[PDB]
Structure formats: structure tokens, C-alpha cells
Amino acid sequence: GLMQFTLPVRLCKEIELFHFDIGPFENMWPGIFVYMVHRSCGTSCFELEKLCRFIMSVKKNYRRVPYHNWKHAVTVAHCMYAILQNNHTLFTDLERKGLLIACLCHDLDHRGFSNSYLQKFDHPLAALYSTSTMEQHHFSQTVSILQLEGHNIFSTLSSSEYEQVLEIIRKAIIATDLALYFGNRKQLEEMYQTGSLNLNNQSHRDRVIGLMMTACDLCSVTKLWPVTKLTANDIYAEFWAEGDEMKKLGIQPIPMMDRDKKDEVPQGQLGFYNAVAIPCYTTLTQILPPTEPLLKACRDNLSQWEKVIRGEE
Template identity: 45%
Template sequence: MFIDLNLVEKFRINHEVLCRWVASVKRNYRPVSYHNWRHAFNVCQSCFCMIKTGGLESIFSDYEKLSLLVSCLSHDLDHRGTNNAFQAKIEHPLARLYSTSTMEHHHYNQCLMLLQSEGCEILSHLTSSEYAHVIKLVQHAILSTDLAIYFKKRNEFFNVVKSGAADWLGNDGHRELLR
């Protein structure tokens, strides 16, 4: 998927580094029944299919495509199979650290950690401003997977589509909803 979207070439991602990063992401999923590596891979492949067959290849920038694939594979990292309400009720340290979107903040944090791990730095050829841009997109994408946020954004998205005034290229707000 990274090769097909030309991201490996565009961002000069070393093949071995990419493989090591993917293997590390896989290893940091737990063997829970749903939020496991298979789920992350499925989400990534669905996103890839939407980009390839939904006409999004010419709408999203390379930075956005890279961010989306990284986010999809990373969005449930270290999931324990329990939801945010559960973390709050058992007063888990993570719930004290992040009072809202508890698990999503943790997934994002794990994602950042892996991107910065030695030998897994797939973004190492980006300039500091490019890196900051990609990370911001990744953060937004992963935090948006909190269902409490997702359903609100989903409604907004459908309203934009139904209004017939969707402008994916010119309107940053619309584009953000699409991502």
C-alpha cells in the first residue's frame, strides 16, 4: 500500500525501516478479540481501497495519504479490549492522564513512540515542518476514532455531502471531515 501510493519513493522511506516499523506496530497490538493487528490492517486496507477506488488519490496530498496509512495501522495500538468508560470506572492511570478520549490519546502516544524508535523512523527524511504537518494529521486522525467524536463528525460529514456544497479541494474544514 505504501509502495502503491508512491509514498516510499516520495518520502524516501528505506524498505527495511518500513518493514521494521510495520513489524513493531504489529507487535504492539495485543491478542484481544477485536482491536488487534488484524483489525488495524483491515482498517488500513479499507482506507487504501477508498483512496484508490473512490477518486481520493487526486484529492489528498501525499502528506495526507502517508498520514492516513500510518494512522490506520496505528489507531488502536496497545488496545486492551475495554472502552474509555471502563478505564474511567476502574480509575486506570491512563484515565487520570487523559480525562477525555483516554484510549485514543494512548494509541496516538504509542504511535509517536514507534515512529521515533531506533530503526523504525519511516519519517526521517521529512523536514521538521513536514514532520510536524504529518504528525498533526496523524494526531487528528487517531483522536477522531473516539466514537464519541466520530459520530458527531459523521453527521457533519453527511450534512456537507447532502448540502451539495462539498468542496474537498478548496475548503479545509470539508477536507478535514473527509479525512
């Protein structure tokens, strides 16, 4: 009960910054996550024994793929921790609880393949879930683990507080389907600009949590250049494996997934920063001004990709 988690001084200070890298020591990531729950939620949010057992079952259910792995889960949760800590008074007790768990769980049991590949392979999961295939699976795996004995971290919540948090988590995880982000950000753009955005309106809060989920999920583009550059290799290593599997089904993959077209990566990153990342962190900064360091870091990385194209590195 009087048991803090504490971190070495360099981590204690840097973990509060949006651009923090959780580092290569896997055995420290559980403690980093518990540290973040304790500071953003409280030492009383979860029974430590249950939380530790829940974290280790979540870890066990992430696969050894190059990008959509346990490191990505904890990275996306740290970005959410940074957003929550810079926007102290905007979020409910239940939202603080639900969103760090949602982030840790959002890619549970990912196989390194897109919704599109599952649909073309005719994977069983594509028949069970016609849209946001992997994301409905991730929520389903979250509920499974919550129902393991000794794993219900929400046990002290009332019946209706419990249903509310599981509903925050479901919407948060569904929102990580990037196909839904474009529409969601357009609506948030219009609401903010006509002045109709209202954070007492639940359907509005939902949209804003959706955008935060996109922002955390994409946070590799908000790191220092050497982190951003090295994560991009992991990201393309999955896409190219998927491209290879598309070719096995007799389908030319899109160039993004075709390892023969590696040369167009710098130009593909530009498109991505311009069409997805910058718009994402721009609208997030408009709604939540203290998240501006994410937009600034993203702009700095776009400018580094421009330098790569000009052969200045």
C-alpha cells in the same frame, strides 16, 4: 530500490476490492501492508529497512485480544488503501503517507476495553486523558515507536512536512473515537446538502478524513457475509469480557456487554447498522462516490441480519 513486493495472483487482484479479507496467515500481513504503501504512496515514500522495522514494532505493541489486535490494524489499513486507490487525485502526497500509517497505528496497545470501562475502573490513562482516553494513548504509542532508533519512517520530510503528517495522524486516530463520529457525520451531512462542503478548507478535509477513519474502522460490516458473521464473535467476545469486569466493579453492564443477553445480538446488530454503519457509508458515498461498494456491502449484511432474525438462518 528496484525491489517490488508482489503477491500471489488471487491476492494481487482481490486486494484492490473493498471486501478483501487479508486471510489467516499472519506472516503475510507485513508484506500485504508494504505492497499497499508501494502502490498508494510509491516505492520511494519510505526507506524499506525503516518501514519494516516500524511495522514489526507496531505489531509487537498490539495485544492478543479477540478483536482489537494486529489483524484489525491491517484490515483497517487495507480499507483505507481501497478508498485512496479509488480516489487517486483527491489526496496530497502527505495524506497518502500519513493515513495508511494512522490506520496501522490507530488501536496500538488496546486492552479490549472501552473508554467507559477505563473511567469506571479509574485506570491511570483516564486521569492522563479525560476524553477519547484510548485514542490519545494510541497516538502517544505511535509517536513513541516513531522515536525508537532506526524507526523514523518520516526522516526525509522537512521540519514542517513532518509536523503536518504527525497532525494528520493525530486527527485521524482521535476520529476513531466513535463518540465523536455522530456529531462529525451530522456536520458533514449539512455541509454536503447546503453545498458549503469545500475540500480546500482544511477544517473540511479534516472532517472528511475523520469519516473515512470511521468507515475503515467499521469495515467488518462491509465484508462478505461469512467474514462479517465470524468477526462479530470476536467483537462480542471483548464486549462480554468487559461486561464481566463491570459486574466485578458492582455495575450492571449495558445489554450489549452482558453475555446473559446473547439472544438480543441479532436485534443489536440491526440497531448498529441503522444508527451507525449505514449513515456512515451513505454520507461517505455522497462525498466520495467511488466508495459506494462499501454502502452496498453494508446494506447486503443488514439484510443478512434481518434474515437471521426471521429464522431463515
